[PDB]
Structures are given as structure tokens and as C-alpha cells.
Amino acid sequence: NECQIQKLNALKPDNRIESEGGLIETWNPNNKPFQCAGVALSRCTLNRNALRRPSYTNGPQEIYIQQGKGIFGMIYPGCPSTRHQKIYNFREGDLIAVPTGVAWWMYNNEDTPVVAVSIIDTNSLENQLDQMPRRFYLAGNQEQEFLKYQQGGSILSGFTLEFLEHAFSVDKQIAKNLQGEKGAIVTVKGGLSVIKPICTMRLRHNIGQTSSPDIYNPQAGSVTTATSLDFPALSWLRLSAEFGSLRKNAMFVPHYNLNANSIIYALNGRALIQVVNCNGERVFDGELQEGRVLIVPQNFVVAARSQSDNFEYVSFKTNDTPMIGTLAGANSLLNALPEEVIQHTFNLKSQQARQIKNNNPFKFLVPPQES
Amino acid sequence: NECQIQKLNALKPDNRIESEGGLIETWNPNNKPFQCAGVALSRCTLNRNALRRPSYTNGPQEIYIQQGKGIFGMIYPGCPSTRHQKIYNFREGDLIAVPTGVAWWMYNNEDTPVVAVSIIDTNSLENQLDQMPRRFYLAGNQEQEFLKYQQGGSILSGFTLEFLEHAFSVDKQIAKNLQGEKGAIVTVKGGLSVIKPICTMRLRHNIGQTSSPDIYNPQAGSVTTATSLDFPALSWLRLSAEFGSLRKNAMFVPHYNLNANSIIYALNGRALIQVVNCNGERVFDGELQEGRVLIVPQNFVVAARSQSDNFEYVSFKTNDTPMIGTLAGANSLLNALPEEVIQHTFNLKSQQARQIKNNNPFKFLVPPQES
Amino acid sequence: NECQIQKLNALKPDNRIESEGGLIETWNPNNKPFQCAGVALSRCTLNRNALRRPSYTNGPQEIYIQQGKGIFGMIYPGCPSTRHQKIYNFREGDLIAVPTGVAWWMYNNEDTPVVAVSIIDTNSLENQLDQMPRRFYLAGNQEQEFLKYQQGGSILSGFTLEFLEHAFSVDKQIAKNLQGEKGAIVTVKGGLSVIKPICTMRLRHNIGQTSSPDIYNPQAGSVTTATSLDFPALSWLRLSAEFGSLRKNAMFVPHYNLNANSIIYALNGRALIQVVNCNGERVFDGELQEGRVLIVPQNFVVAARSQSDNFEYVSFKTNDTPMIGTLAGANSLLNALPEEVIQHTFNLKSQQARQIKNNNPFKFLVPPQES
Fold first, then answer.
1. Would you call B279 and C143 a contact, using CB atoms and an 8 Å cutoff?
2. Cβ pair A224, A242 in contact under 8 A
3. Are residues C368 and C307 part of one domain?
4. Is B144 within 8 Å of A278 when comparing Cβ atoms?
5. What sequence ranges are listed for the domain Cupin type-1 (chains A, B, C)?
6. How many domains does chain C have?
């Protein structure tokens, strides 16, 4: 049973690939948390003047930009150019959606490096190969990030020198340059001079600190969710994301996701999280701090208290329109029960039954206890 | 190969979990018939004043009510209250729809117990965990029905006292009660005074005690089906159900389900069934009695001859719009054939071929042979 | 890991069944390429006056007629008769769409034997049984093509005489005839007197040389593809196909399917094919010749150079709207990339980057190298 998790742990990467203009880190997809989850996590960071060479995966991918600014371009097959296809800019808090098998390249021009953390849902209907994550690079000899877990060069360097020569219609010499002969993130010495501004579908939506949050409480913090309702290209991925920023000691109530798996990646600070399963067992009772990830499976209950000012996280849910069941708060599940059945399922009295329903008037985030 | 079954048998429950005001019976979901099917059956009977405590599952659920009258309520996350959300009434014959993760509760008030037989489609696309059935109870300390198969407390009892005090904003004492400290089906001493009557979606459709049978033969019986067509909440589940009443010795023609898995549970009487596979092997040739279940895989063919007045059954099919291919009778696949191809594939004469296409005028149900 | 394929090979069939009026060949569905592709391939052949007795399967099928002419009939459950349901005539180059579970019969009257190569998508969502291919014949005592791999009689010959009797309302004499008491393909001595002209939807479309192609280069050849845009019954199958003819020494560029697996069947001639994976390994390099099959996974990259006048193939894609990403061509992925980024990923000088974007001005198909 892939999802019979005994104990979850704040996971951190087990693979660092240092490249010329950056670095790529990946989390093991063969751990029972990720196997249960159905995702492959990774965190790519590009420095000044670095370009992440074009590549593609066989699954839905969702990229969240932790820090920095740059530009990115998709190479969508049935689309028109301009010379070249469309290029979008991006900032911190941007959620980029990458449809199955589509190729892209990303570039950074500032001193502040781009830190992009992403997920490939390898258990998608669209992924027709097997659960193993894999990336297909267009150019350059270097082994793909997920090769380590399988057990190189790019797709073009694998052909025969005469087949490139024949296909592209060029000579032996530039056919050798194309045929492989630095890694995925190379440094564009002077800098890519390319202008800074489904084919017309927007694949960039901002959920980070620069938005109009869904839930806002000036004493507890705020939450901003991006479903396919507000970012229509997400329905093409069947993926979502959530950004939260909690004030020290404020907490998000116990809640479960009715239809999605969550992968909570901590952006800043630290938190005391608690998650419990179908058998009442508390499968995690600890701290999740910056750069670590906690996986909460489908109907498991989650609650967190902030130990920082502020504790920020990104939550990749595996459903483009995730529904969450709240267990405490203005709109809780207990709030919708008859007071009388609340009395008989929890063994309380009518008065106490009123207290569970009405003592906490806040939706999802609750302020510091004020002690 | 889960469905490469050699011999089907009428299955019984292997788990009884007596509770204060009721009982819970569950069939083993690891026997190959059920692995092939992708469901998990369960029969919950609730005596007078029994309140089944709030719970939810990680998969679509469909409840047929074999006997009794009660009230049931679903706590749907995005929904408006009235105090509390909607309370629906039910009668024997009703089909209750339960979308993945939605929490519900049930109550009975009359002497005649409620017996509700139900299936959880663990093989659903909305089941992002594993093929293990699981119930997540919002209250009470008790081992959930399926824990036996896996190898307790509620989801709220797994949390630290400090966390529940904060989340609900209540004192230690009431927080202690909420945190556990009679099993799933409890008894309400005085009885609930709660008013006997998507957030709009009708999720109750009567298929047993109706008067609008899909097919009706006064000399053979009747059969009713409830598809999404007439019960739209069912497209949320991708599940269906059929109710049939068969007179002694009457029969339902050899047939198959093109796009679904049937789980036939006998509600009354007995009947002689025959089910044959792609190889011509008779994988089951015996009788199916009250309270027993026979699984007929996807394109396997089934035929039944009644042995009681009447043999009633509910067949849960795994598709909200199942399609059956009747092999004998008014709209049989052989009727739609050319008279000449039926002659050459069956090796019959022109005259005989006419009899197979017209001797039985009846649709699905065929009257007793008259001996 | 099913699709973690090392070396591919042009596969030829392992099973063969000489029927009265024909022959049936089937490829082993438990080979790793087919295990990975999720399909079963079979080549049936009807000689003159041959009839294929009605049968069905647990999954979408897509038949392509290599050669010959004849008529076929599909027995759809709720469809109206005319005496019998509607008949359609087929010609070579036709692609017939058969829904999951639907039954169909096939007849050939010219001397010229019909050769039809088809696939069953066992990995479908419609397939609720297991990864085994299995045909369910309505008549005749013979063993189902695929039994061999699983390790007979039809679905009627398994039933008891008195059940069949009561079912069709007949006499033990024809009931016995009916109960099974010449294989799947049976020759009709005089030959059917049947004419030669969802219930109305078109389930036949020609993708043969006769049709207007999607690509036609007078020097390279031509390509025709049938999606659900131009043949909507395929949106039910979630399958599609592609016919291609290639002049000697011409070639189709290196490309990959973004959203589908492909099963290349060599109709005529021989070619030299190469396919490389995500690591950069040419997992195949040799020649796919007539009557052989090459499975090319999802994002794997293929390239073929014709060795005949002309190499003709049928590519079975597992998606009704397959998106292809061409790597060299007028339309190519590199063409959308800025000149400067194709400079930096491929270590090229500007003028060399322009040469890749423009030397080859053709879509998909490139003429012979001109030697």
C-alpha cells in the first residue's frame, strides 16, 4: 500500500547538480511520501546571465518562482511566431503552468538569482510512460536530473551525424555542433540581448506576496489560492497551488483536502505542523522549516502554528480545483452540523455545543492565542 | 491479472462490528472478485434512535436503503447553512449519492431498523491514495471498519490538546472531550429533536419502492435503473445502480455490460444464476440468496432464473451511464443482425434463424416457461 | 518500470490461427514495448466469401484495412433496425472506429483477401478488467485469439440448454445448435445475399493514398492523419492513426509525440529508423521492414529515412488529438527559439544559427539529400 504512511518527515533533497550558471536540486521520487503523492519535486536556481537550455517532461509541470525575475519561453508546436515565438517576463510569486511534453527555456539577468521550485505530476492521465520522472533535453551533453533515480546527452546528440546533416539540411561541421559535440544551465557571457516586454493562453499567474489574498487577517496572516477558476491554463494540468504567510504564533486550523494531495514546501521561516490519518495516529508532530517539504496525502487532516514572523509556504495540490474541508472556523464542517448531533457525537452539552460552533469566528486562519 | 477469475462464489461478510445502536458488516476487499471489481461493499444497519457519527471516504460512495426510514445529512465544504446545512429524508428504496471526501451522518427513529447496503469505488479516479478502503471519522474512539484489512480514535483525537484549544478557542476541558475520551453507531438516549422535513444538487433517488419501472412485465417482474440521466448527482460519482424484482421461474435474458462492473447483492429470495466468460467457461453456475453478493465483471455474460416470489436485487454498476447488450429478446444484438449472418455463424437454416429473432418478443425480462 | 526501455526491435507476430475462411495473427502483449505502449496488435485476414463471426472486447479498438474491399456491421445496443441495424461498406485505406464493448461482424466477397491490422487499447479508462487482451465471440466453438497469452467456445455455448431454451423461447433442437453445437473466420458457401450500398455517427474514414493528404511533397512523399477534428468517432476511442508514404531516400524529420504512444506498422517497403530516449541513447538503429512493428513511446524522438519507392506505414497513436513536436523543419521547435538562444544552447555563431532556422524549408517531410 503506497499510501500507508507510518510517519512523514520534513524531506529535503538528496541530489545536487552544479552547473556553470546555476544549480539543480532534486528530491527522491522513490520515498513512500512522494510515491503515495504521485509527484516529483525539484528546485532549480539560475544565477546572473544564466539560461536554462530548452527541455520537456512527460507530465503536467507547475513552476513556482521563490525569488528573482527573468523571462521564459514555451515552444508550443501548433503556434505562430513573433522570427520567434512569444516570451513572457516573470517575477517572484509567479506560478507558471507547463502543459505535458511542451518545451521551455528560462533566463535570469539580475544579481538576485532565480529560485524556482517545481512539480511534475508523474501520476497524470497524460503521462503515458511509467512513474519514473525524466527530462528530455534539446541540446547539450549532460545527464538529466532524474537519471540518478533511474539507475548522457540530449535527444539530438543521439542521432547519426548523417541524419542531422540530412534533416536540418546543413554540413558535417554544424551538424557536429548540433550533435552534442557546462550543463543544463549555461552562462550567456554577455547576456541574452532578446528584448524584455492555447497560443494566447496565459501561463503565468501571481500568487506570491504581491496580490489580493483570498483570506486576510491583519492579526493572523493571509492565504492566496490559484485554482483553474482564476488561472484557466491550470485545467490543462489538473494542478493547483497555494501561498500562505502566517504571523508568529498564528495558526491554520485543522483541515483536509477532499480531492487532492498537497506538497507543502516552506519558503520562509519555520512552523509546528501536525497531521493525522484515518486511524487517529499523529503521523507528523514537528517543525517544517525553510527549504524542507512535508507531504500530506488526500484525506489526512493538517494543522500548523507559526514559529516565525512570517512563516511562508507554497502548497502544490494535485487537482486544478481543490476543495478543503475545514474542522474549526466560521465555515467549519462542525459548524454545519445540528447542535444536537454535535452533542451526541462529541458528548457535550448544548451550551458547550454552542461554544465549538461560535468561539472561533475566523475563516481558516486563527490569531495568536494572546497569552 | 485481477479479473482472470476461474470461479466466482456468492460472497458473505467476513467482518461484523457491533456498536451501541447498530452493526457494521464488511466484505473482504482483497478477495480477487472484489480486486477485479474495484469496490468495497459494506452493510450498515442502525436500530431505533441510532445516529451514525460524521465520517468521510477517499472515493465515491453510493448507498442503497434496503429497509427503514430516517434522516441523513451531508456537510459540503463550500455551502450555506439553513445554524446548520440541509437535512434530507430517506425511505427504503432510495439511492444516496456521496461525492469523494464529503462528510455525512445518518439517523433512524422508528423500531424497524435501517439496513443500508453501500459501495465505495476505491478504483475511482478521485482516489489519489491507494486501493485500501478507509473511513475517516470526525468523532469517537473506535477502529474504523476496514482497519482489519489494512493490517483507534477519530481525526480530531490525534491532535495535541494545545492545538484543539487554539483552533476552536475553547478551554482544556471541552478540548479534552473533542479529543476522544459505543463505537461508530451510537444511540441517542432521548432521540434527536432535529426537524424531520451542488449545495442544491438532489442526492436522493428512489429505485426500489417506486411505480415507474424502466421495464415492467406483469407476468415476469420488473427492473428499474437509475443513471445520471435521471439522477444527475450520479455523474459526480461515475457510479450507477439497478433494482429488479423477478417472479418465480421468470428470468432476465443472457446479457452483458459493455462499459461497467456489476456487483449484484440479493435483497430478497433466491435465484439460479449463470455467468460465462470470454472463453465459454461457466465461471458460476449456482444460486444467489438473500444477503449474498456475486460480482459479474465487465464484458462477462449473465443470466438469472428466479426461485422466489420475488427475487429482488440491487446491482451497483461502476459507470453513471452503463450500457447493456441483451443477447436474447426484443432488442437483442442477434435481432439487429442480418438473417443470413445468424445462419452462417450459428449454422442454422433460414426458417430457424427467424425463430431466434422473433420467438421471444419480450425485452430483458421473460415470463415463466409455463409447464 | 514498464517504459524504461533499453533496446527496441522490429517485432513480428508469435501466434497464428488458420481459420476456415482466413487467418489471425497476434503479437505477444507481454513483450516490454507493448507492456509500455498499453496496446494489443493483431492482423486478421479474410479470403473470398469469408465472414468474421460477431465479437467484442473490453476496450476501444481501431481497425485499419491494409487491402481489400467488403462490408462490416456494428450491433450497437440502443440503435434502431434498418430487420437489422445499418451496414457500411469498407475499402482499403479505411480506418474503422469500434466503441468499447460494441459487437461487429466482417464480410469479404472479392477474390482479393482483406488484410486488416488493428489495435485494442487495453490501457484505456473504459477497460475495467485488467491488462489482458480478450475477445468475446458470440458464436462458434473455437479458441479466442488471445487465450494463448492468457495461458474454448463462445459466450452462448457456456450456458445450459434449458437456460438458452427459456431465453430465446425455442426448442431443444435449435437451442442445441445455438449452444456452440471453422474458426472465427468462416467461409459462406454461396456468399451472403446481404446488400452492398451514436446510431448515425460516421465510424469509417479513409486515410489511404486516395485521400487528400495533410502533407504532400512531390519529391518526398505525403502524410495523412485522422484526428477527432476530422473524424469525431475517434474522440470516443481516444485513439487515432496516421498513414505515410515516403519516396526512396527521402525522410521524415526527428520528431516526438507530446501526448501519445505510437505503434508504427510497416505496410509497404523498408526503411531505416532511429529512436533516442531521454538519456540521449539511440534505443533503436536498424530497419523496420514490411509486416513488422516498431513501438515508439511518448516523448521519445524518431527519425526515419526511406529505403524504398515507397515505404508506407500506419501509425497508431494513443490519443484522438495527438500533438507532435517536430525537431527539424519549417515549423520546428528550434524555429521558435530566438537566434541568440539557439546560439547559446548549441554553441553557434549567429550566422550558423540562421542556417538551422532556414536551410530546410519543408514541413515534416524532407526530399532526398540529392546525391
1. yes
2. yes
3. yes
4. yes
5. 8-176, 205-354
6. 2
Task: For chain C, give the residues followed by a break (C–N over 2.5 Å).
Answer: 82, 151, 181, 197
Task: Note whether C145 and C19 are same-domain residues.
Answer: yes
- Which residues of B68-109 form beta strands (DSSP E)? 70-75, 88-90, 94-98, 103-108
Interface contact flag, A355 B174, Cβ < 8 Å: yes
Beta-sheet pairing, B215-217 with B88-90: unpaired
Q: Which domain holds residue C46?
A: 13-207
What's this structure's resolution in Å?
2.8
* C residues 250..269 contacting A (CB < 8 A): 251, 253-254, 256-261
Which residues in chain A (321-340) have CB-CB distances under 8 A to chain B?
A: 323-329, 331, 333-340
Query: Do B182 and B219 belong to one domain?
Result: no
Asked if C178 has any chain B CB less than 8 Å from its own CB, the reply is yes
> Which of A264, A268, A274, A271 is CA-nearest to residue A312?
A268
Q: Does A285 touch chain B (CB under 8 A)?
A: yes
**Which of A75, A141, A143 is closest, CB to CB, to C337?**
A75
Residue of B nearest to A331 (CA): B77
Helices A339-346 + A350-358 axis angle, to 10 = 110
Nearest-CA distance C132 → chain A (Å): 18
Task: Tell me, yes or no, if A150 comes closer than 8 A to chain C by beta carbon.
Answer: yes
Backbone angles phi, psi at B293, to 5 degrees: -140, 140
Q: List the single residue in A with minimal CA-CA distance to C304.
A: A163
Question: Do C214 and C202 share a structural domain?
Answer: no
Number of H helices, E strands in chain A: 6, 25
The answer to the question of residue C64 being in a domain is yes
Which has the closest alpha carbon to A301: B223, B134, C342? Answer: B134
Residue B326 to residue B302: CA distance in whole angstroms: 10
Residues of C in contact with B369 (CB under 8 A): 165-166
Domain boundary among A180, A207, A234: A207
Q: C174, C207, C240: which is the final residue of a domain?
A: C207
Q: List own/partner pairs for A129-133 with CB under 8 A and 24 or more apart.
A: A129/A58, A129/C2, A129/C3, A129/C36, A129/C297, A129/C298, A129/C299, A130/C1, A130/C2, A130/C3, A130/C4, A130/C36, A131/A29, A131/A35, A131/A38, A131/C1, A132/A29, A132/C1, A132/C3, A132/C4, A133/A29, A133/A40, A133/A57, A133/A59
Distance from CA of C227 to the nearest CA of A (A): 14
